[PDB]
Short mmCIF file of C-alpha atoms and ligand atoms in Angstrom, two decimals:
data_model
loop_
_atom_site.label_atom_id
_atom_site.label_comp_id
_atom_site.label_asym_id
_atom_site.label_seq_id
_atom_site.Cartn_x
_atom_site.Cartn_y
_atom_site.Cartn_z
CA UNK A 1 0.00 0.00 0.00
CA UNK A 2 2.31 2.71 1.40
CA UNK A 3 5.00 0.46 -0.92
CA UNK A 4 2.98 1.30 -4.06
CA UNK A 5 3.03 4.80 -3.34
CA UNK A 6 6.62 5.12 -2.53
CA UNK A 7 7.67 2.80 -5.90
CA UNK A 8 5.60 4.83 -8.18
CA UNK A 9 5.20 7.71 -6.72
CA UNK A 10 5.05 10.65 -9.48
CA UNK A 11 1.23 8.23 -10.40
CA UNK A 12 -0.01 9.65 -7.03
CA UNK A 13 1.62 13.30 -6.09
CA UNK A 14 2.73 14.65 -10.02
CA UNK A 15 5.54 15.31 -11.42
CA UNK A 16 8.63 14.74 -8.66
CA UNK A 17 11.79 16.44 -10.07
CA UNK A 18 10.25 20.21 -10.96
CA UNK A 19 8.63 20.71 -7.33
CA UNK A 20 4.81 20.51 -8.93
CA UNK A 21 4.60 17.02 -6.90
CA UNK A 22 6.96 19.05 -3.98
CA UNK A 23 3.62 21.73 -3.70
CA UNK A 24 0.66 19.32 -4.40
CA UNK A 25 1.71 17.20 -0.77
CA UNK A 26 1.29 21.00 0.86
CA UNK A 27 -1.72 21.18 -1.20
CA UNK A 28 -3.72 17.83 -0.44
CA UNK A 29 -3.16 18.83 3.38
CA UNK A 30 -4.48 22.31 2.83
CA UNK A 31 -7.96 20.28 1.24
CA UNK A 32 -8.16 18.26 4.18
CA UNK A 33 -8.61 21.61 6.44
CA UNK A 34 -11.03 22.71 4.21
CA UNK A 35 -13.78 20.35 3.76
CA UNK A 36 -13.36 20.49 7.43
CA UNK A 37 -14.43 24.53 6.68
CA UNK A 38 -16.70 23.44 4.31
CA UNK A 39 -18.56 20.99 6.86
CA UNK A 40 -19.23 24.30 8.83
CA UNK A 41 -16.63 23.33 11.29
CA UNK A 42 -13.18 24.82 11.16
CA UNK A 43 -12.41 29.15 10.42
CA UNK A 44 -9.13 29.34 10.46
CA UNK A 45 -6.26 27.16 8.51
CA UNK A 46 -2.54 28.61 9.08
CA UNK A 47 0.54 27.12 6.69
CA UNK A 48 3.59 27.37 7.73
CA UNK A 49 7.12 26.97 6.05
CA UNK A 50 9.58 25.99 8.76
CA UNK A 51 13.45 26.57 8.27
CA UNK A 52 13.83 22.89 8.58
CA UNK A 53 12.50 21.64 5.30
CA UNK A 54 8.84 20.65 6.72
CA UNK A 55 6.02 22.59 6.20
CA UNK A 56 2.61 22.35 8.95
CA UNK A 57 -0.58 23.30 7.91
CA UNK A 58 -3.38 23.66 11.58
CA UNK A 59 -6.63 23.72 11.66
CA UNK A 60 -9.34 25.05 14.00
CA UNK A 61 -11.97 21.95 13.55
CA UNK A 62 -12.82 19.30 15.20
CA UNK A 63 -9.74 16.98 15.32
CA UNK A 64 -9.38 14.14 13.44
CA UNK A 65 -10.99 11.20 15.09
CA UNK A 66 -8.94 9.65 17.98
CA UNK A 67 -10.65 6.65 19.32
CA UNK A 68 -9.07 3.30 19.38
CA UNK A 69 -10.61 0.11 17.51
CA UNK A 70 -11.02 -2.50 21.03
CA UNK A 71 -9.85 -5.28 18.80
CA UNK A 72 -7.46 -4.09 16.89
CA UNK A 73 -5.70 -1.93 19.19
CA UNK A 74 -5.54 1.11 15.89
CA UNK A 75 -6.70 4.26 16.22
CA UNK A 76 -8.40 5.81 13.85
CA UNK A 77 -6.14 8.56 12.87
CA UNK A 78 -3.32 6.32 12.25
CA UNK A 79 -5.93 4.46 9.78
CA UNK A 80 -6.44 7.67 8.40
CA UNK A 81 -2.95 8.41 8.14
CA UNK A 82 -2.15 4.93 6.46
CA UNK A 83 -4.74 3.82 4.53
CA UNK A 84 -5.32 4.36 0.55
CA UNK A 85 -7.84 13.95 -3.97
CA UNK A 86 -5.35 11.69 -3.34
CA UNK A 87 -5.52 11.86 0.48
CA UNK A 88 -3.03 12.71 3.57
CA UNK A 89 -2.07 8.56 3.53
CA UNK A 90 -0.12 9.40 0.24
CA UNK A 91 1.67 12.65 1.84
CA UNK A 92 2.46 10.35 4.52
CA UNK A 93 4.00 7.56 2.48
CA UNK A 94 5.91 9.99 0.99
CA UNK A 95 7.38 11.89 3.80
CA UNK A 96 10.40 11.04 5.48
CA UNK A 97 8.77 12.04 8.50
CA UNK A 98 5.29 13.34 9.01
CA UNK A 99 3.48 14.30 12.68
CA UNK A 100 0.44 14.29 13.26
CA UNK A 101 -0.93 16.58 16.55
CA UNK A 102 -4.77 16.66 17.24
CA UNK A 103 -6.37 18.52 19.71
CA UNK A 104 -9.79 16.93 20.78
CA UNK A 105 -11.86 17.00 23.59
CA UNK A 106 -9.88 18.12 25.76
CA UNK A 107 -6.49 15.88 25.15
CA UNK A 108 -3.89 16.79 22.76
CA UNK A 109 -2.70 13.36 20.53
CA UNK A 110 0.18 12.52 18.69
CA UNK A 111 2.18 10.15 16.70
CA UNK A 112 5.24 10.32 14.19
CA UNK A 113 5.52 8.60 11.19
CA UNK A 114 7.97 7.91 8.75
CA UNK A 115 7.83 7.43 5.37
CA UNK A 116 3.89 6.58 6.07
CA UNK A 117 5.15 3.32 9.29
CA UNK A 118 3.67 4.84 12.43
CA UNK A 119 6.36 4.79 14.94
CA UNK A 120 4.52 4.54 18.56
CA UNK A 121 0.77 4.66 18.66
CA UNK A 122 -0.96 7.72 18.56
CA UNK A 123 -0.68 8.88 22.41
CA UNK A 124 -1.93 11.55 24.82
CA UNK A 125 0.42 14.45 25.18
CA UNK A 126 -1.67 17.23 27.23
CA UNK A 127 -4.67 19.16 28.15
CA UNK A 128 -6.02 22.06 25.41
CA UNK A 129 -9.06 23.91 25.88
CA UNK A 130 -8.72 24.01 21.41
CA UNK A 131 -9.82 21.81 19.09
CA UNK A 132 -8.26 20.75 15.82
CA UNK A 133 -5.96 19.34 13.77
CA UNK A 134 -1.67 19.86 12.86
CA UNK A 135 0.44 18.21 10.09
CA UNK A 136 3.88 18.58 9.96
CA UNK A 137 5.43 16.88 7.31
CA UNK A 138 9.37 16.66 5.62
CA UNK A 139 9.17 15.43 2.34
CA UNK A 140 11.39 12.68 1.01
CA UNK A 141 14.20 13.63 -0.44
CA UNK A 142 14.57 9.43 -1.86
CA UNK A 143 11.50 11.09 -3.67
CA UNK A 144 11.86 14.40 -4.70
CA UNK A 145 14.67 16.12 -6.67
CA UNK A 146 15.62 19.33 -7.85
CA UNK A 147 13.17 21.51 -6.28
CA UNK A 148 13.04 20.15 -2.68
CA UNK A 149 12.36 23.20 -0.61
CA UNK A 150 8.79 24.91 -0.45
CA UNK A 151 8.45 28.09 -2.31
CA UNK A 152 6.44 31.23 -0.99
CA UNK A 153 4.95 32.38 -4.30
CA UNK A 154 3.20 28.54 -5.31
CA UNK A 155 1.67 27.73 -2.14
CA UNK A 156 0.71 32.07 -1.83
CA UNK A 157 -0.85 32.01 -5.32
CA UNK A 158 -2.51 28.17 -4.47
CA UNK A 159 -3.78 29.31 -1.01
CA UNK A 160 -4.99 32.44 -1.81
CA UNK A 161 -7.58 30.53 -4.53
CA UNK A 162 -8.09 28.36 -1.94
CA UNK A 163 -9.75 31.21 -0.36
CA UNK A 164 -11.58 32.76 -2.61
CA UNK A 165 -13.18 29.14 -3.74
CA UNK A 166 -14.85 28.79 0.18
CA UNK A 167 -15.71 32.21 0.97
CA UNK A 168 -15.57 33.04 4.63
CA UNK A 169 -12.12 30.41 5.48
CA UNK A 170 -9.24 32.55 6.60
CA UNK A 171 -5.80 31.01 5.52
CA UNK A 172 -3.06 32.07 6.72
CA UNK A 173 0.76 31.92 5.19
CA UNK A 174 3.90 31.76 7.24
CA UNK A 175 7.27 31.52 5.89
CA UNK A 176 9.70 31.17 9.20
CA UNK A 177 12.63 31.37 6.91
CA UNK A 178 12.32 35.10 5.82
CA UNK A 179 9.30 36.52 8.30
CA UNK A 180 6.98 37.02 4.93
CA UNK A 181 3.63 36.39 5.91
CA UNK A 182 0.17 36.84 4.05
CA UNK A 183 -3.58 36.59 5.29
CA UNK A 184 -6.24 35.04 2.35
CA UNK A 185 -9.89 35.59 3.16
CA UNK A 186 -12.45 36.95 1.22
CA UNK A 187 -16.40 38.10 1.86
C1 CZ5 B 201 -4.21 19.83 8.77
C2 CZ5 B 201 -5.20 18.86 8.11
N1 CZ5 B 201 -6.53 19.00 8.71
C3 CZ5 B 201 -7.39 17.98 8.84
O1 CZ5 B 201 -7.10 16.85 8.45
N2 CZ5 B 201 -8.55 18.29 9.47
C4 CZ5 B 201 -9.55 17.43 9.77
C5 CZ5 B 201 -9.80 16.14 9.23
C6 CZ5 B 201 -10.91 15.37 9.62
N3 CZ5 B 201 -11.05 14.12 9.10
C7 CZ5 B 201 -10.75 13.68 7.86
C8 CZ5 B 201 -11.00 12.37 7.79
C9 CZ5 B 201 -11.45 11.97 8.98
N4 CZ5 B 201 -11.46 13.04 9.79
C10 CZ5 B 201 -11.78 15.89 10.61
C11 CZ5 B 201 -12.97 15.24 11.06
O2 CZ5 B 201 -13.80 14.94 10.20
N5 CZ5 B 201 -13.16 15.11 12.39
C12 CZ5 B 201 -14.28 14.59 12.96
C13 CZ5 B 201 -15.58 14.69 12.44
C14 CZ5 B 201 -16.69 14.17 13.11
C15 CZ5 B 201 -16.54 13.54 14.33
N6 CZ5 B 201 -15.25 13.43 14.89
C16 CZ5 B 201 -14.14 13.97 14.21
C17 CZ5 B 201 -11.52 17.17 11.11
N7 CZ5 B 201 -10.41 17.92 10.68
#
């Protein structure tokens, strides 16, 4: 599954080796946020390009879902995370390291992945009075070539459609490795 991906995996993202593939991992995150927005549930999505070649994208929502299967001892974010709009399992697979934090009644969860292989279950790391959802990814650089560092002026030019497209969701974009920053919403 997560082997498919990673063998083949300019089928799934794009192209790998001109950064198109680089942007659409930011990009399938970013959709995740909103059609949390567009179930009525989440305002505010902030992306952020860290100075460490990952990028996090937070939500406001509801959290992905945290609860544990009794037999199977999985919860159901890491079957989210893992499982085969391409979907966040691809990002994942394709990641040299990916965390996920939700914050959810009451708790805030996490667990690490990398390259898509959970590597402790999802645990409980706190108390929040917030709800909703953080990916942090690194993409992998097995994967991509060329173009392996995020670039303000795609994910800007992405994001602020993005916007525009679900009237009334504020993004946010932060680059930590220059201070830019820009605000997309639109009435
Ligand atoms: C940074 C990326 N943001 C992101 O992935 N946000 C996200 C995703 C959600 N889900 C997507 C699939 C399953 N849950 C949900 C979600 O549907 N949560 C949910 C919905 C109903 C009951 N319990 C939890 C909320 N937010």
């Amino acid at each position: 599954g997560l082997d498919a991906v990673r063998k083949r995996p300019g089928m799934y993202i794009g192209d790998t080796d001109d950064g198109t593939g680089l942007h659409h991992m930011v990009f399938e995150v970013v959709d995740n946020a909103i059609d949390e927005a567009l179930a009525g549930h989440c305002k505010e999505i902030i992306v952020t390009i860290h100075a460490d070649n990952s990028v996090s994208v937070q939500d406001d929502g509801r959290g992905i879902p945290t609860g544990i299967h009794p037999e199977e001892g999985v919860s159901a974010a890491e079957v989210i995370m893992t499982v085969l709009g391409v979907g966040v399992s691809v990002v994942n697979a394709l990641s040299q390291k990916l965390e996920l934090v939700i914050q959810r009644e009451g708790k805030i969860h996490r667990q690490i992945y990398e390259h898509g292989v959970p590597q402790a279950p999802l645990a409980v790391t706190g108390e929040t009075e917030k709800t909703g959802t953080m990916v942090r990814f690194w993409p992998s650089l097995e994967t991509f070539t060329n173009v392996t560092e995020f670039e303000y002026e795609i994910l800007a030019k992405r994001l602020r459609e993005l916007s525009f497209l679900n009237s009334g969701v504020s993004i946010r974009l932060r680059d930590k490795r220059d201070g830019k920053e820009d605000h997309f919403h639109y009435e």
